[PDB]
N, CA, C and O atoms as a GROMACS GRO file, in nm:
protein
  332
    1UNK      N    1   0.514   1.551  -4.504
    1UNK     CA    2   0.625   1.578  -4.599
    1UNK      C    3   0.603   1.506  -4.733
    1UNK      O    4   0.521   1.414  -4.738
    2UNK      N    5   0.668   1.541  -4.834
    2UNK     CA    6   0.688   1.455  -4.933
    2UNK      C    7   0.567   1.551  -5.038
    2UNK      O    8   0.598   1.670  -5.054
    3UNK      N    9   0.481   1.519  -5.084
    3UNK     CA   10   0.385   1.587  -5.167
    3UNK      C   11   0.327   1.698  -5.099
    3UNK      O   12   0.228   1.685  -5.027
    4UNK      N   13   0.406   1.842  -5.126
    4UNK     CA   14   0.333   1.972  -5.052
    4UNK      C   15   0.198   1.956  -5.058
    4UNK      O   16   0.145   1.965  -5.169
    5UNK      N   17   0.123   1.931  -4.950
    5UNK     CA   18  -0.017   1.959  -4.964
    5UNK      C   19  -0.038   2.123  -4.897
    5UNK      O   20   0.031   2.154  -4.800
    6UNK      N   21  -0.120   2.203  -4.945
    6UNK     CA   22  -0.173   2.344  -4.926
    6UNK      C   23  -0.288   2.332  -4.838
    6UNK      O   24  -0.365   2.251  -4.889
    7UNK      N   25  -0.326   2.370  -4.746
    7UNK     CA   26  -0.437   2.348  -4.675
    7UNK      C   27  -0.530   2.507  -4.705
    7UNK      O   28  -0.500   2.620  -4.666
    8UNK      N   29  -0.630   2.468  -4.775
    8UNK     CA   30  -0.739   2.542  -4.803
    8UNK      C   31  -0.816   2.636  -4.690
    8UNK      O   32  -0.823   2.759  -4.690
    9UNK      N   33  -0.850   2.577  -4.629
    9UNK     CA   34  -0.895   2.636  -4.468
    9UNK      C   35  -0.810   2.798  -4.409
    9UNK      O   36  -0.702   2.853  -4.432
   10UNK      N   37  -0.872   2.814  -4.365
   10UNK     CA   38  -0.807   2.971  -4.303
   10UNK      C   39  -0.754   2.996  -4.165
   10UNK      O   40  -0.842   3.016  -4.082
   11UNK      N   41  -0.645   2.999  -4.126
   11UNK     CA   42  -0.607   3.025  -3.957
   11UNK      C   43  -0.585   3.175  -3.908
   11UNK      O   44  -0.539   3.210  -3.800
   12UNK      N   45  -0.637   3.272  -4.035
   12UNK     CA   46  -0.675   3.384  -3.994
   12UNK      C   47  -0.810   3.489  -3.937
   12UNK      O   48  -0.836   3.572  -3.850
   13UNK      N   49  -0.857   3.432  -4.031
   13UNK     CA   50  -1.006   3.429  -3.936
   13UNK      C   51  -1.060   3.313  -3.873
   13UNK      O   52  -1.034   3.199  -3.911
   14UNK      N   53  -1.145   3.346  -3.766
   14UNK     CA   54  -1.231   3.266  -3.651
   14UNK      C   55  -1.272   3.136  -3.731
   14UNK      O   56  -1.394   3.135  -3.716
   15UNK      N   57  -1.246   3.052  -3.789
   15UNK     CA   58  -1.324   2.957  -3.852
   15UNK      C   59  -1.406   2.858  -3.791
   15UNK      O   60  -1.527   2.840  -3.810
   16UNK      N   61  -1.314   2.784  -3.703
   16UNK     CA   62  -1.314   2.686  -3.609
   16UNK      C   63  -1.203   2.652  -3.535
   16UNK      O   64  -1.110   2.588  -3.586
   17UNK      N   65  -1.203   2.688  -3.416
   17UNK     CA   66  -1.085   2.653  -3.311
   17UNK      C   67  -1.070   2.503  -3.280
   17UNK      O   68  -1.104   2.477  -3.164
   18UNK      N   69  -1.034   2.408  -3.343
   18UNK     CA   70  -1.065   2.308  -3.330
   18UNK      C   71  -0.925   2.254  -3.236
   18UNK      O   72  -0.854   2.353  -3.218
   19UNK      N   73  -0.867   2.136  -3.175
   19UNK     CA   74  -0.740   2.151  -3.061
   19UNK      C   75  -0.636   2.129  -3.148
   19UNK      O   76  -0.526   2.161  -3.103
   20UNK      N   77  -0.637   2.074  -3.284
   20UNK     CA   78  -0.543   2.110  -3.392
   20UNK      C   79  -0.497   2.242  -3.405
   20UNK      O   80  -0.386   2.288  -3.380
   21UNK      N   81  -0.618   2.307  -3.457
   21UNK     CA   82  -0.575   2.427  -3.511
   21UNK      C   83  -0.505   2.564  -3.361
   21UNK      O   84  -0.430   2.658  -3.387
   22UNK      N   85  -0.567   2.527  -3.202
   22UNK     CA   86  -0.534   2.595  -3.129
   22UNK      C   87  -0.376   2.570  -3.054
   22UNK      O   88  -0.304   2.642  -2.985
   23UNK      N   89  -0.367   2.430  -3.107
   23UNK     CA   90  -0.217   2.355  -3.067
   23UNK      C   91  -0.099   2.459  -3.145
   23UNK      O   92  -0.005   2.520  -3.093
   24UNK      N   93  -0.148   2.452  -3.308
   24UNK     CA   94  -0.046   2.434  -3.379
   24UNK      C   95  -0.022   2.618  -3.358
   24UNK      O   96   0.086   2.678  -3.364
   25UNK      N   97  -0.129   2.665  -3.337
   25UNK     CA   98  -0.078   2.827  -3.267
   25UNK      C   99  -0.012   2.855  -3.178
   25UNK      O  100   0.078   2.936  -3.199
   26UNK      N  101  -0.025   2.812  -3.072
   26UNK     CA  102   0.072   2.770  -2.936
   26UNK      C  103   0.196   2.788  -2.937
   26UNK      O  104   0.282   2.859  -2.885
   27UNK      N  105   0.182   2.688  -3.025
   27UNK     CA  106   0.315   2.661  -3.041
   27UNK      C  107   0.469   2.757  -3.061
   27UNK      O  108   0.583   2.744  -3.017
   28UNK      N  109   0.398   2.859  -3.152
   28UNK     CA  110   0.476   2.954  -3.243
   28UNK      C  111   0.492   3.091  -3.139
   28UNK      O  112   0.578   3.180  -3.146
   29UNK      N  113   0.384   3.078  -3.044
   29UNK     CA  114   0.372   3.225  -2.907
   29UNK      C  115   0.458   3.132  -2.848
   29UNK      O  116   0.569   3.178  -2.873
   30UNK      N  117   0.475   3.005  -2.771
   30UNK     CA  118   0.546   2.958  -2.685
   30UNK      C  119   0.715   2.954  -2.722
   30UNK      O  120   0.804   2.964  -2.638
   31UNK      N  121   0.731   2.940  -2.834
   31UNK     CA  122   0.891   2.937  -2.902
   31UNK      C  123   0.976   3.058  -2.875
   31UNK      O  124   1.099   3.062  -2.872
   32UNK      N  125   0.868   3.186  -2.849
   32UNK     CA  126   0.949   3.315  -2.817
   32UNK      C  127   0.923   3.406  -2.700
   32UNK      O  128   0.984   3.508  -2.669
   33UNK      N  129   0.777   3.325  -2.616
   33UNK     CA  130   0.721   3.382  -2.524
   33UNK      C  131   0.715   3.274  -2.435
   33UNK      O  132   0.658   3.167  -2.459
   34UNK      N  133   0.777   3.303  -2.326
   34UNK     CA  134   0.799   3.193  -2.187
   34UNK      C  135   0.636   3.139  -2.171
   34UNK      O  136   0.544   3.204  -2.223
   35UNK      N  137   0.618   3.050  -2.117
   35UNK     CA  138   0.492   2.964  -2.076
   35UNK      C  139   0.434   3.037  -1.937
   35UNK      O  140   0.316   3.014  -1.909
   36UNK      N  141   0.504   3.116  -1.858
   36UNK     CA  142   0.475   3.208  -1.718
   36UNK      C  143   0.373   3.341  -1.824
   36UNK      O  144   0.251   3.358  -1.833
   37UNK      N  145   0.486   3.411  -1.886
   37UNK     CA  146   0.450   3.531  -1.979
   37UNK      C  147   0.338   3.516  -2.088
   37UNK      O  148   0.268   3.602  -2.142
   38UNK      N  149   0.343   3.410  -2.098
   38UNK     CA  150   0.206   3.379  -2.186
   38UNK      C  151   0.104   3.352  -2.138
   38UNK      O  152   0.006   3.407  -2.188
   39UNK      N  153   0.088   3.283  -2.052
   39UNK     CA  154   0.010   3.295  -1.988
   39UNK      C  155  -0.035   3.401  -1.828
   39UNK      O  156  -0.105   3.402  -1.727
   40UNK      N  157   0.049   3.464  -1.894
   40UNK     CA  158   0.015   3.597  -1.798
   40UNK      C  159  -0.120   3.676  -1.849
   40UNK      O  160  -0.226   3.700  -1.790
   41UNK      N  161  -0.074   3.708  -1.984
   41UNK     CA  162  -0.161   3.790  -2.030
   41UNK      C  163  -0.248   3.699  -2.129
   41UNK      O  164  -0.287   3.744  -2.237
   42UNK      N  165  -0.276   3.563  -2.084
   42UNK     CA  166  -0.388   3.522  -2.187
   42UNK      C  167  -0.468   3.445  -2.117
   42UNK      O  168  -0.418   3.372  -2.032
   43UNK      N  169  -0.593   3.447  -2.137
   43UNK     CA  170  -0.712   3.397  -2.005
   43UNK      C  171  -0.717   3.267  -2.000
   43UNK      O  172  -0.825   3.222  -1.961
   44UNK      N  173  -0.619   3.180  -2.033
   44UNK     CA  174  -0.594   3.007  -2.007
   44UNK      C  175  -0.523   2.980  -1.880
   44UNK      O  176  -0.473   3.061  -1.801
   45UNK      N  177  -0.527   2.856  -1.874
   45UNK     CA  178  -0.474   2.797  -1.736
   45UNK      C  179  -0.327   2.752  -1.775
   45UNK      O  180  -0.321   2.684  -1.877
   46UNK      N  181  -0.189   2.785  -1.701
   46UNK     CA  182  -0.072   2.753  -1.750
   46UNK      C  183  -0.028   2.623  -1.780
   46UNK      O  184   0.020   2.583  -1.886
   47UNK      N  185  -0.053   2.546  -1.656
   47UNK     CA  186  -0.017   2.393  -1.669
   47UNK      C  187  -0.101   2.330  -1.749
   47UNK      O  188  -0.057   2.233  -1.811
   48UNK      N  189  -0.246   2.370  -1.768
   48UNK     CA  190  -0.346   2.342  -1.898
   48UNK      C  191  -0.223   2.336  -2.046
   48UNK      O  192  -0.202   2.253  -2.135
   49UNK      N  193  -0.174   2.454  -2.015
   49UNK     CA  194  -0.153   2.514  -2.206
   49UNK      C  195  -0.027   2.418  -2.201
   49UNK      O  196  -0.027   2.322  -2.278
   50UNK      N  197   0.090   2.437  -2.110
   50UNK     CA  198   0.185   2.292  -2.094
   50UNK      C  199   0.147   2.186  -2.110
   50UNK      O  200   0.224   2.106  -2.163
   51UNK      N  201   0.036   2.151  -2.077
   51UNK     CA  202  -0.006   1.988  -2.068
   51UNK      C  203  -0.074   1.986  -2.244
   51UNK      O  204  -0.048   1.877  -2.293
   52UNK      N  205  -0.110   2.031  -2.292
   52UNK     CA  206  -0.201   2.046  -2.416
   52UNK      C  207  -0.053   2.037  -2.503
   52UNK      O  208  -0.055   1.980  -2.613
   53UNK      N  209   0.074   2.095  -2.450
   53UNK     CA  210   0.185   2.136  -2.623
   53UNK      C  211   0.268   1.984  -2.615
   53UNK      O  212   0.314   1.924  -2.712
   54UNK      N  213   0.273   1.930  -2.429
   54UNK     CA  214   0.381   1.824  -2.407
   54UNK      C  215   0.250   1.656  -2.441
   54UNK      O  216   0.288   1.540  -2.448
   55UNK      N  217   0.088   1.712  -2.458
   55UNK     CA  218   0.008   1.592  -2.456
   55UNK      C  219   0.081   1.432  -2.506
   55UNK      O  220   0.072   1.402  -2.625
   56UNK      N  221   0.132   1.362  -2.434
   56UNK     CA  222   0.152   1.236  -2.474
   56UNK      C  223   0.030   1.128  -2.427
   56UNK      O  224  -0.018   1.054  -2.512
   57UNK      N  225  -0.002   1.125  -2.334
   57UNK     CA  226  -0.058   1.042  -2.274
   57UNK      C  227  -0.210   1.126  -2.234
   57UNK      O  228  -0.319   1.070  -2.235
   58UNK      N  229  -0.185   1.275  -2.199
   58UNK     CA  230  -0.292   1.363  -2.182
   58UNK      C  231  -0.437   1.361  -2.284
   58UNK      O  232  -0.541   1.304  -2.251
   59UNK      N  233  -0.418   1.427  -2.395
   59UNK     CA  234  -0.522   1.392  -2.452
   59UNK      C  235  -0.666   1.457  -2.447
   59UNK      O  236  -0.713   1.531  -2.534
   60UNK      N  237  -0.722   1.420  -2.343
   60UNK     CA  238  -0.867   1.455  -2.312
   60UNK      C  239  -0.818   1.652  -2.271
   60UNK      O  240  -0.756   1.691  -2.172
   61UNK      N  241  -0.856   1.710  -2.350
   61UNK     CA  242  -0.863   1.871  -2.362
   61UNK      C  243  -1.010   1.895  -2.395
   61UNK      O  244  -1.080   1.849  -2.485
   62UNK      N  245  -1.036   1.980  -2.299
   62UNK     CA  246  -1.190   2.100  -2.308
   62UNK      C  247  -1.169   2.175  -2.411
   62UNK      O  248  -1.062   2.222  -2.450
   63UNK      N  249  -1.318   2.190  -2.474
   63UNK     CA  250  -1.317   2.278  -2.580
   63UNK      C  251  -1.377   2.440  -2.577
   63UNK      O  252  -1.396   2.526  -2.663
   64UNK      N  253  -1.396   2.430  -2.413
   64UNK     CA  254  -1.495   2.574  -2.384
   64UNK      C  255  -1.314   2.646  -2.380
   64UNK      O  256  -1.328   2.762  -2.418
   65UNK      N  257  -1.200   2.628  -2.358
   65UNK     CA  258  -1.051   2.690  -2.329
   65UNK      C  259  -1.031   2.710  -2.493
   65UNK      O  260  -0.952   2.802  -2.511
   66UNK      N  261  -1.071   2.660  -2.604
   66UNK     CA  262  -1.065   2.665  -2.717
   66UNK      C  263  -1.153   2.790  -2.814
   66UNK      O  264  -1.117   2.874  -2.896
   67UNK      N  265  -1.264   2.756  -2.766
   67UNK     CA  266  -1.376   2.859  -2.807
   67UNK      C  267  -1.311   3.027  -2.770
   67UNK      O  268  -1.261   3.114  -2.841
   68UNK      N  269  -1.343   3.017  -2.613
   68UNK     CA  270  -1.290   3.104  -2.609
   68UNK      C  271  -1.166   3.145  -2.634
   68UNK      O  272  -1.179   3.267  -2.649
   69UNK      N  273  -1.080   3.126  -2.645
   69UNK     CA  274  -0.940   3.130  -2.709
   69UNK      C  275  -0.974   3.215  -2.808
   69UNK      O  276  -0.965   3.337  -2.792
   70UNK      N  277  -1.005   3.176  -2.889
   70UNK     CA  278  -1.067   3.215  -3.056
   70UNK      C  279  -1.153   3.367  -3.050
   70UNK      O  280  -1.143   3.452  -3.138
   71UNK      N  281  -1.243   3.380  -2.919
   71UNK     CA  282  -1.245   3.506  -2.880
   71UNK      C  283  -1.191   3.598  -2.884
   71UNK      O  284  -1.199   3.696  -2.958
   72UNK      N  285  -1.067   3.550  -2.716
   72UNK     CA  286  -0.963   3.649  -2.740
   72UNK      C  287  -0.869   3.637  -2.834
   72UNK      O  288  -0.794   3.726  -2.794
   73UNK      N  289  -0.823   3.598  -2.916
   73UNK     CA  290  -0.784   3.597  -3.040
   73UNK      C  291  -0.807   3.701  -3.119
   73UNK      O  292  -0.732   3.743  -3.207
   74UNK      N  293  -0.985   3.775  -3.064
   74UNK     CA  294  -0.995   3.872  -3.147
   74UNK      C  295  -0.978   3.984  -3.072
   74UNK      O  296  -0.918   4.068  -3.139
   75UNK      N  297  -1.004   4.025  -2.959
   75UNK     CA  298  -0.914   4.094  -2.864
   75UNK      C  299  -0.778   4.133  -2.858
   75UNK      O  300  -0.739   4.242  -2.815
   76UNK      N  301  -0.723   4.062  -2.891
   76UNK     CA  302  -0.596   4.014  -2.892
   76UNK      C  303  -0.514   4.110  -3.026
   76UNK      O  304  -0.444   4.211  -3.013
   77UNK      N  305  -0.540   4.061  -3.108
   77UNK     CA  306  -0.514   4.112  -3.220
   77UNK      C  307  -0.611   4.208  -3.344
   77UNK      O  308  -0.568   4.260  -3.447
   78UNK      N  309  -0.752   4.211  -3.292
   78UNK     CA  310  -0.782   4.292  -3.329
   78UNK      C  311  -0.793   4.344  -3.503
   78UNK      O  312  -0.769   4.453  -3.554
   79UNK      N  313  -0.834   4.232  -3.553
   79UNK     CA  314  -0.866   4.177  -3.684
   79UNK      C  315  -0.927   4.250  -3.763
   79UNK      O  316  -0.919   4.245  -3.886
   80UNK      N  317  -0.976   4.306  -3.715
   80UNK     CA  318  -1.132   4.402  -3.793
   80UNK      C  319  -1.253   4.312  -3.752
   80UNK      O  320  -1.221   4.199  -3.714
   81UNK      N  321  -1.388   4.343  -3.753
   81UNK     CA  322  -1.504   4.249  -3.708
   81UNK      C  323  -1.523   4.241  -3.590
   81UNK      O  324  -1.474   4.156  -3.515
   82UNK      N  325  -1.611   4.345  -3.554
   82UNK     CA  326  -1.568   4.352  -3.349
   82UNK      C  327  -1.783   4.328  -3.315
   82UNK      O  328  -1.882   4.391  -3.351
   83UNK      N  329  -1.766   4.237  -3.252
   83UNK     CA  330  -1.908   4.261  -3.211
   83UNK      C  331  -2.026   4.333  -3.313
   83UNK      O  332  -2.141   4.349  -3.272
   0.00000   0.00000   0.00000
């Protein structure tokens, strides 16, 4: 807060899934899509994606659940740029 900073970087295309940038997405599917339903139809582990949004003490997160993420991401939505 305080001095708007603009972040240059892109969260629309594939850039880098880094656990920042895959958190702060989460977040915004989980606010309107139950944690069962979301992870119904998305190839992560549920109590993974819970444990990753509630991380206090957690922390240590894999980055192969990230990578691919960013995959289906393009699956998913279907961006333009297919293979």
């Amino acid at each position: 807060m305080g001095h708007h900073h603009h972040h240059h970087s892109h969260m629309l295309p594939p850039e880098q899934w880094s656990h920042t940038t895959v958190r702060n997405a989460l977040k915004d599917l989980l606010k309107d899509m139950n944690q069962s339903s979301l992870a119904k139809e998305c190839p992560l582990s549920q109590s993974m994606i819970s444990s990753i949004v509630n991380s206090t003490y957690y922390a240590n997160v894999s980055a192969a659940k990230c990578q691919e993420f960013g995959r289906w991401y393009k699956h998913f939505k279907k961006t333009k740029d297919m293979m």
